[PDB]
Nucleic acid binder design. Structure first.
Lengths: 111, 50, 100, 116, 143, 48
RNA sequence: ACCGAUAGUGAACCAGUACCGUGAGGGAAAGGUGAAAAGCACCCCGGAAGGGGAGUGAAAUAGAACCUGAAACCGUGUGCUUACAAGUAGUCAGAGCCCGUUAAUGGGUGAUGGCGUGCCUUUUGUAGAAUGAACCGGCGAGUUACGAUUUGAUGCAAGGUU
RNA sequence: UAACUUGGGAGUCAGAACAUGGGUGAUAAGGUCCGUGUUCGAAAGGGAAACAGCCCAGACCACCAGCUAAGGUCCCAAAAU
RNA sequence: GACAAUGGUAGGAGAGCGUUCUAAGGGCGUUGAAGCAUGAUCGUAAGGACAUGUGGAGCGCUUAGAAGUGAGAAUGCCGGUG
């Protein structure tokens, strides 16, 4: 049995999030909570929450002790983007993208 | 100068072979019992204990 | 004991109980055919000669009439609006050799 | 009545993409590029059917020459003897008769030599 | 479709020794390039290699016909502008006789991924001896 | 019988629509050849 | 024998409006939860947003960014293969290794050999270093009214027809 | 085995090289302008290393089948060291 | 059954497939229609079927009739994503 957790429409761009997800994909619960707390990247204070709340469904809905858990699925998907503009030189404009992502973590007891 | 040809999904994914961040390289503290950065203080409670 | 028959404008090496595919004959399925032109009888048996051995017929039973795998014949000429497309299935007959 | 195109354009742009699977990169994904490669593939196949009957003949002739050289006689000399002897066995059978059996082949080399 | 092809499992290979004493450079090279390629055995199998290892001995004794020892130049380039070098076939043989024979035979094998692997079966040594006694190399006589 | 009707034989023919592909015989140029005054729209010459 | 949300009025959606111009003036985009709001009480993680359960309902992968949900494009896992090689990237020949179909000379992958200079326009002649196309999806070009002349068909016939 | 006659519908009016008779140029030019053939244009396949026009030859489709053309037979590369 | 024929641009002639709608007949559909997805299937071609999912209310077949009747290319128009 596996418990999942999602954070829909976070405002960090998706291929900035993906740099962190790699470092934790396959590690252990207590090791994963520590890596996301000693890294200097900006997507750490958000990804950590999505992981600290997958472990609250792994024990309150089902019944698993939170010591022997591994991280099985960790990916970031795309979300709807925002259109913006920034005026350039000599009466011309250029577009901007405010990108968004969905983050997802699944923790399991290897059974 | 401008690009003459488009770039394929293959040539784009080889360039990023090396675009990855490394492990922070941490150790457990012999008080807190919690992972801390090497040669720094334990944030959870500060005890360097040189 | 192998022999060299001459059936469909081609030659075929034949052994007892071998399954061989040839060009469409008129014989019905479940019947028994015969080959009247044998070129070479050899191997374990006596080496013989040519143009054709005397007597020496080979017998077989017909298993199925059919149609081979489909192919597609496409061609074109560039910068000239000219293409063409055709299909084709070549028919066949499957036999099994039982007396050389 | 107004007749808009529906499901008739999609239905024949997928008959062309399925015929191109295993192709590298974008040649199995985009229609404009997979349609040119499906066209060229058919032209090559038509040419390659004809050359398959040339390639295999220059394979049976090398094998037969290498079998005949053992008995101190060239492929050209042996072939000329067989025609006089009226044996009439095509290049494919002689190669198989030689690879499978050495003894039967000798019984031919000898006859050609007798014919001269 | 009764044709027989040969695979790695069914292929064996022999070892031979050819002597270059009193032999023309181009009359010996041609015959050795038909052994390495395997055109003397009935199972030719063009996709697969079936050739035999050959060992040249006494490669200094190789002989050229007519005014060549001073009228045949071997040229090379080093990719730097103006760097093009040359050496006369006489001096090459009094200097490095293994190279002479070995660069004439290889200009007769095809230039593909498979002709590169058939050029590694050629061993060339000037001395009347050879270090490959561990196999059983039988002699082959050029016709 | 209003559900099996057939006209006389030999009478109706189907009209010809030009410019609908290469395998019809009336494709790219639609039966006009190449550049000229009889290939532009609006036509070429007076009745005289 | 008219359209069905790029169609039909510019306009099925508070449109001659948001906006653009000193002014005359121009001018868009935007429909659909369910039969019925019965629009998720309470519990847990979090500052919240957002989730995981429990419930409503025939259906929540019907949760108001609401029917269905294609392609480009972005990811996660995995069965065969690749670090001495000169490639319009396919096509014919072919071992090895992994699966079992609308059951028939089956399907996937591909060490190694042979042949091999994209498509369309315009030209005496284009791989062309001549033109055009970033890719995907929708829309986008011999028609109708009246006259004339020739073929096929049908009716009557020194008559035929309004 | 084609011809002519009356009616319906057309396209074409920028041509190129090679051989052989001649102008013009300089018994120069893949120059140019005429006469006379063929091939390209609108023609794939084999040879000339690659090479629209040169030598051979005109593809209805299928084949791990035979005899030939130009050109060829020491190795690359099929057939005479 | 016998023999002969069957390369093709501009162009002329003949036979066909599919799309939306209508008339008449005859049918399938909550015991799951169209459409969307996957498949190793049948025709000389354009193309037609049958199983399995996803969906949830309409749609084919036979014979005629009428057309806003088929898209890869216009530095085409509009939306989306590189």
């Amino acid at each position: 049995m596996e418990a999942k957790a999602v954070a829909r429409t976070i405002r960090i761009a998706p291929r900035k999030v993906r740099l962190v997800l790699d470092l934790i994909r396959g590690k252990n619960a207590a090791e994963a909570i520590a890596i996301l707390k000693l890294t200097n990247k900006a997507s750490s204070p958000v990804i950590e929450k999505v992981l600290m709340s997958a472990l609250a469904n792994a024990e309150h809905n089902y019944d698993m002790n939170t010591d022997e858990l591994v991280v099985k699925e960790a990916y970031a998907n795309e979300g709807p983007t925002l259109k913006r503009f920034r005026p350039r030189a000599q009466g011309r404009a250029s577009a901007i993208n405010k990108r968004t992502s969905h983050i997802t973590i699944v923790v399991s007891d290897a059974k | 100068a401008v690009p003459k040809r488009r770039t394929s999904k293959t040539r784009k994914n080889k360039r990023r072979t090396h675009f990855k961040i490394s492990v922070p390289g941490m150790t457990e503290c012999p008080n807190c019992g919690e992972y801390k950065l090497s040669h720094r203080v334990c944030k959870n409670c500060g005890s360097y204990n040189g | 004991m192998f022999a060299i028959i001459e059936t469909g404008g081609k030659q075929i090496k034949v052994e007892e109980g071998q399954e061989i595919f040839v060009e469409k004959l008129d014989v019905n399925e479940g019947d028994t055919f015969t080959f009247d032109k044998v070129l070479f009888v050899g191997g374990d048996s006596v080496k013989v000669g040519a143009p054709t051995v005397e007597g020496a017929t080979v017998t077989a039973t017909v298993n199925k009439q059919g149609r081979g795998k489909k192919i597609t014949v496409f061609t074109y000429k560039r910068r000239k609006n000219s293409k063409r497309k055709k299909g084709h299935r070549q028919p066949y007959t499957k036999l099994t050799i039982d007396k050389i | 009545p107004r007749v808009k195109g529906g499901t008739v354009t999609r239905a024949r742009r997928k008959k062309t993409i399925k015929l191109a699977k295993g192709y590298f990169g974008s040649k199995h994904t985009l229609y404009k590029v997979a349609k040119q490669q499906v066209m060229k593939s058919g032209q090559y196949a038509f040419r390659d059917r004809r050359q398959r009957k040339r390639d295999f003949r220059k394979l049976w002739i090398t094998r037969i020459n290498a079998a005949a050289r053992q008995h101190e006689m060239s492929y050209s000399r042996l072939m000329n003897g067989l025609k006089k002897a009226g044996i009439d066995i095509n290049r494919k059978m002689l190669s198989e008769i030689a690879i499978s059996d050495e003894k039967a082949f000798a019984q031919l080399v000898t006859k050609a030599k007798d014919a001269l | 479709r009764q044709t027989f092809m040969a695979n790695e499992s069914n292929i064996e290979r022999k070892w031979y020794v050819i002597d270059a004493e009193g032999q023309t450079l181009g009359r010996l090279s041609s015959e050795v390039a038909s052994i390495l390629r395997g055109k003397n055995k009935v199972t030719y199998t063009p996709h697969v290699d079936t050739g035999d290892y050959v060992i040249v001995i006494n490669a200094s004794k190789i002989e050229f016909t007519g005014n060549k020892e001073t009228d045949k130049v071997y040229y090379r380039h080093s990719n730097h502008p103006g760097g093009i070098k040359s050496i006369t076939a006489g001096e090459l043989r009094r200097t490095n006789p293994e190279r002479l024979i070995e660069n004439s035979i290889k200009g007769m094998l095809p230039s593909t991924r498979l002709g590169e692997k058939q050029g590694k079966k050629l061993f060339v040594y000037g001395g009347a001896e050879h270090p490959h006694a561990a196999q059983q190399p039988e002699n082959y006589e050029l016709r | 019988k209003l559900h099996e009707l057939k006209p006389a034989e030999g009478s109706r023919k189907e009209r010809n629509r030009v410019g609908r592909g290469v395998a019809t015989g009336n494709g790219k140029t639609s039966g006009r050849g190449h550049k000229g005054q009889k290939a532009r729209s609006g036509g070429g010459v007076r009745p005289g």
